[PDB]
């Protein structure tokens, strides 16, 4: 078959375009290499190690075409290779292999990697390939395929190689960026507050492997030689890189630090985070790719990783229960915010029960009643979550993940600390499954928030049994919908592929199908490859006429 | 009927840390719930603090407890069933439930209490991998027994059990069988070895090889008969399984992970008491799973260990993070679970403090398809790798060379 | 005003300002002709199609219409002199680099754009799209949304769930 499957794990220390291949799998998969002067020595050597040692070989095929099995042959240790013979040898460091994860829905999901043979029994990926594969190391498995000819090797390494997939045509932007730990660490490393001592600097310098041995002069010479987080990260950025970004209220003096300015691959200001180093826009990875080429770019991923990870190892980072607690103050305010919405909902009930509520046009009373109640409840939840997020302080670990952009969101923090909020099946509040009540603990005809599944408590405080059940109800609805695509979508994608599968760009720039029928007179109506296309501003178009003339 | 949730709702300040309740009351109650925690089935009765978890994560746990290893029964040694997994050293969980009493969990537990640190530490525990202590593994952590048993009969004219000797056999040696055709307890097997030696009448070979990817020692061999006739045979094979890169492990909150790498104690980070994690999970696996219960279990279990008490993790009680935090503080630890830690490599403090405590972890089953179908074909087309496509999808069917007319 | 286009003129320019250590406090040695003629000539060179007839020549003019808008707006004389402050040397390098990046951006005959397209739409649809609608219903109430909607589309369903006219 020439292929292998196993569990995958992340490796801070592989290059972006590498795959750790367990030695034991590497012995099982061969490549037929024809014997030449350029390799006779190597092959001879390999044949001598045989099937059981790596780098070995499993067979030697002579001219006549006969395959000598090195597992059993009398002459396993007494073979003298001729030119023209083939040696089925083990895969080795730097062989291009094709690596893929299922289901593979788009093409950055089979990419060619360079092998790195390693101990233990899992495949190992650089952290930044995780996203294009939609992989994680919680039991996921992957397939490795070994090309079997000189032409197919070339094909893989010149067309599928990981670095050639960095900028993707899917959305005309990077499909890989700095993630997880490295994103968390990279923000922290680059705050104005981060300073490094000489001793630590020398290590970090030494860790970026394409380093020229020249110690950047410290941002602070006296009272003590001290180096910026920015200064050292900068070593990982290659010369001739320029980048310029302006977030909200960024000035040429960015009070908040905030924004991003890179000149000649030296960070002038701005905290490096997801909009600078994620798969952004953008975006240092976009920029380096385009200015410096895929190889140099692909190496950046590992330089930054090596440097940041090391800094992170010695700084440390954690999260705990205390990061979900709000000082309340905030609590009092959140409790009061909700007590407020229970009052607007009560006042609308009294109203609508007097028969004073007016319907709108083309909505029932009951419909337009529900609408009001759901908006009060939603904006209460909303502003209770906001109250919690402002109280989180800079040292707050969750808030730090968030700022760095590494997981998760407002909603996450809000359910945990403020208020889970309204459960819902089929887009309405919890239905009267019992006769006129949602549970037998209520009286009949009770449309209060409690009754219809507003969860008032956060996960921190824990749910009451009623809120527990209603939250399960909402729970299940999401599970069922996940189970309906898997596979309702693996089926759409198969249909989409079939309709388009034969469209190709021809040497006259037209796109045509297999009968040769014209589909677009020029591809994309502009003849361009989506992977070389990026958001740019058409100035000519905005502003007053006075502005344009000037 | 009208049902009261708590019996307290049948009677006639507010502690900020409690969850908010809404009564009315009521005066018209006909019944009252025995205990609300009773709406849960058997699986979910095992999750500590499910009322602080995200709804679907409870569901994931419910399927996962079913893949944990424990001690399925106490007579395990005398049953010869298809597969079995037993922990060497099951521990009762520091955070239990009232419902666990009736579920026999404390008695037949399915995990151990790891000292778990929540830390970014070297980066080998990202996207849900875990860093495990090689030294705790050395000392027994998560080590488990594994038994597989193979079966075979004779006949249905005749077949017989015997060591055969080439008069079409299988590759792996028949060396280990006695002459009755069976290996015997104590013999160490591996690879493809003939476990059961069977012949069909000179002689066509029908013996049972050992599962290719395995090994161990033979445990019991049983010879017997079915209600009529058949002499049949069952061979149980023992293996020990040491925690290892790529093995799966889960807390009781529906997030699994595998071991990314293992460090020895020296290389680990450490508290000032010289305490060291058995296990390091990533912070990033936390915010978004909405997995608060896991943090509370950890807070709760640390107090338990310190004080020698079972930590009550039952749903719908009055137990609170503040409660637990105040208990922990009394033990002289930082109220909120954090501890100052030092970097193993270096001994230097970490600039961050680490959430650090015990938590109950389950070892899950499985170590011990490959395909190029439609969708891989499409990726390679998308790359326009046509040579590879030709080579992968073809055959040794080799070029037959034919001649064709140019007109017809 | 922001639309995906090839060749990032802004960056080519910040490169030029860096490579040539552009002294912002001096006159440029660019003439008016250098710029106006320079830029006109560069458009003649942004090739997507090459056939020498009236039809392909028009198709070519159409193909680079939007890009040339961008180009003329970035390389307006005043903008070059007052904002960018390019020198004759820097400017000449901006032009030829735009040309090189441009030709480098053309799609390559042999691209399987079809599978490309399908995979580009399919992968997000199953990435997902999670839900389904939300749903809705009753209140506010409804409008179907992908995937059920994506399916209605691809099916060309005559019996669509929530048809709606928008009337201005």
């Amino acid at each position: 078959d020439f292929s292998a499957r196993t569990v995958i794990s992340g490796d801070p220390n592989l290059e972006l375009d590498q795959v750790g291949v367990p030695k034991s799998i590497a012995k099982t998969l061969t490549y037929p290499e024809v014997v030449t002067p350029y390799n006779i020595d190597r092959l001879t050597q390999l044949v001598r190690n045989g099937p059981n040692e790596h780098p070995g070989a499993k067979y030697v095929i002579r001219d006549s075409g006969d395959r000598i099995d090195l597992r059993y042959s009398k002459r396993a240790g007494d073979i003298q290779l001729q030119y023209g013979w083939k040696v089925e040898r083990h895969i080795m460091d730097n062989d291009p292999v094709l690596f893929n994860r299922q289901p593979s829905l788009h093409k950055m999901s089979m990419m060619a990697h360079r092998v790195k043979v390693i101990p233990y029994s899992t495949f190992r990926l650089n952290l930044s390939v995780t996203s294009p594969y939609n992989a994680d190391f919680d039991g996921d498995e992957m397939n490795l395929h070994v090309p079997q000819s000189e032409e197919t090797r070339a094909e893989l390494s010149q067309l599928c190689a990981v670095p050639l997939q960095i900028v993707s045509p899917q959305s005309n932007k990077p499909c890989m960026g700095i993630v997880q730990d490295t994103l968390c660490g990279i923000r922290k490393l680059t705050l104005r507050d981060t300073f490094i001592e000489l001793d630590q600097v020398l290590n970090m310098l030494y860790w970026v492997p394409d380093w020229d041995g020249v110690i950047p002069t410290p941002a602070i010479i006296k009272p003590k030689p001290l180096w910026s987080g920015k200064q050292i990260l900068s070593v990982a950025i290659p010369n001739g890189i320029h980048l310029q970004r302006f977030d909200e209220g960024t000035t040429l003096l960015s009070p908040k630090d905030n924004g991003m300015l890179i000149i000649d691959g030296q960070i002038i200001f701005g905290v490096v985070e997801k909009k600078t180093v994620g798969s952004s826009n953008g975006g240092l990875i976009h920029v380096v790719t385009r200015e410096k080429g895929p190889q140099v770019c692909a190496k950046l991923f590992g330089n930054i990783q090596k440097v940041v990870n090391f800094w992170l190892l010695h700084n440390g980072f954690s999260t705990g229960i205390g990061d979900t607690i709000a000082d309340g103050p905030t609590m009092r305010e959140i409790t009061e915010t909700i007590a407020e919405a229970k009052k607007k909902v009560l006042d609308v009930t009294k109203e609508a029960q007097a028969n004073l509520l007016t319907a709108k046009h083309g909505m029932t009373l009951r419909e337009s009643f529900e609408d009001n109640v759901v908006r009060f409840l939603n904006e209460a939840r909303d502003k209770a979550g906001r109250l919690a997020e402002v109280n989180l302080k800079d040292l707050n670990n969750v808030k730090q993940m968030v700022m760095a952009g590494s997981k998760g969101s407002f909603i996450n923090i809000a359910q945990m600390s403020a208020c889970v909020g309204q459960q819902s099946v089929e887009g309405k509040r919890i239905a009267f499954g019992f006769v006129d009540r949602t549970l037998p603990h209520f009286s009949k005809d009770d449309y209060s928030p409690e009754s219809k599944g507003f969860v008032e408590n956060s996960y921190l405080r824990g749910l009451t049994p009623q809120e527990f059940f209603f939250h399960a109800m909402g729970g299940r609805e999401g599970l069922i919908d996940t189970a309906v695509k898997t596979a309702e979508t693996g089926y759409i994608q198969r249909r989409l592929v079939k309709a388009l599968e034969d469209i190709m760009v021809h040497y006259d720039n037209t796109t045509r199908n297999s009968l040769g029928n014209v589909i677009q007179f020029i591809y994309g109506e502009d003849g361009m490859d989506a992977a070389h296309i990026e958001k740019q501003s058409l100035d000519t178009i905005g502003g007053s006429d006075a502005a344009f003339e000037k | 009927i009208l049902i009261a949730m708590q019996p307290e709702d049948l009677e006639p300040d507010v502690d900020p840390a409690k969850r908010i309740r809404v009564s009315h009351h009521a005066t018209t109650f006909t019944h009252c719930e025995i205990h609300p925690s009773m709406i849960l089935g058997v699986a979910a009765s095992i999750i500590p603090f499910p009322d602080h978890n995200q709804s679907p994560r409870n569901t994931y746990q419910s399927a996962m407890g079913k893949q944990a290893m424990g001690v399925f029964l106490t007579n395990y040694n005398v049953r010869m069933d298809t597969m079995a997994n037993i922990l060497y050293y099951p521990q009762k969980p520091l955070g239990t439930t009232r419902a666990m009493e009736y579920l026999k969990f404390r008695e037949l537990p399915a995990g151990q209490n790891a000292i778990v640190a929540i830390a970014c530490y070297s980066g080998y525990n990202q996207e849900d991998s875990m860093i495990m202590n090689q030294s705790s593994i050395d000392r027994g952590l998560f080590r488990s027994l594994f038994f597989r048993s193979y079966m075979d009969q004779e006949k249905k004219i005749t077949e017989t059990f015997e060591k055969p000797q080439r008069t079409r056999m299988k590759h792996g040696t028949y060396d280990k069988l006695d002459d009755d055709g069976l290996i015997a307890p104590g013999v160490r097997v591996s690879g493809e070895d003939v476990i059961i030696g069977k012949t069909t009448p000179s002689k066509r070979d029908a013996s049972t090889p050992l599962r290719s990817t395995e090994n161990g020692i033979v445990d019991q061999v049983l010879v017997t008969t079915n209600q009529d006739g058949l002499k049949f045979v069952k061979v149980r094979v023992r293996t020990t399984k040491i925690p290892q890169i790529g093995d799966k492990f889960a807390s009781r909150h529906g997030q699994k992970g595998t071991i990314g790498i293992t460090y020895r104690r020296e290389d680990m980070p450490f508290t000032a008491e010289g305490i060291v994690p058995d296990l390091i999970i990533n912070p990033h696996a936390i915010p978004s799973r909405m997995t608060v219960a896991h943090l509370i279990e950890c807070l709760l279990s640390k107090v338990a260990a310190l004080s020698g008490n079972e930590g009550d993790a039952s749903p719908f009680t009055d137990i609170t993070v503040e409660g637990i935090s105040k208990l922990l503080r009394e033990h002289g630890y930082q109220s909120r679970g954090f501890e100052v830690m030092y970097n193993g490599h270096t001994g230097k403090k970490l600039m961050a403090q680490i959430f650090f405590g015990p938590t109950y972890y389950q070892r899950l089953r499985h170590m011990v398809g490959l395909r190029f179908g439609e969708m891989e074909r499409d990726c390679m087309i998308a790359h326009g790798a046509a040579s590879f496509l030709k080579e992968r999808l073809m055959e040794a069917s080799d070029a037959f060379r034919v001649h064709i007319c140019g007109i017809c | 005003a922001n639309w995906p286009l090839p060749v990032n003129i802004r960056r080519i320019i910040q490169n030029a300002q860096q490579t040539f250590h552009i002294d912002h406090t001096k006159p440029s040695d660019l003439t008016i002709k250098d710029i106006v003629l320079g830029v006109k000539d560069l458009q003649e060179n942004l090739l997507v199609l090459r056939g020498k007839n009236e039809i392909i020549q028009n198709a070519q003019r159409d193909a680079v219409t939007l890009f040339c808008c961008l180009l003329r707006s970035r390389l307006a004389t005043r903008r070059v002199l007052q904002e960018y402050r390019l020198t004759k040397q820097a400017f000449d390098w901006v032009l030829s680099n735009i040309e090189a990046q441009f030709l480098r951006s053309v799609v390559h005959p042999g691209e399987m754009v079809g599978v490309l397209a399908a995979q580009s739409i399919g992968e997000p649809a199953t990435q997902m799209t999670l839900n389904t609608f939300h749903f809705a219903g009753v209140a506010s109430k409804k409008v179907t949304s992908g995937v059920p909607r994506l399916k209605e589309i691809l099916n060309v369903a005559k019996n669509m769930k929530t048809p709606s006219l928008t009337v201005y």
Binding site: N378, R381, I411, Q423, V425 | - | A139
Partner: peptide, 8 residues
Amino acid sequence: IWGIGCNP
């Protein structure tokens, strides 16, 4: 599980 026109 969040609110109407968000999550169940």
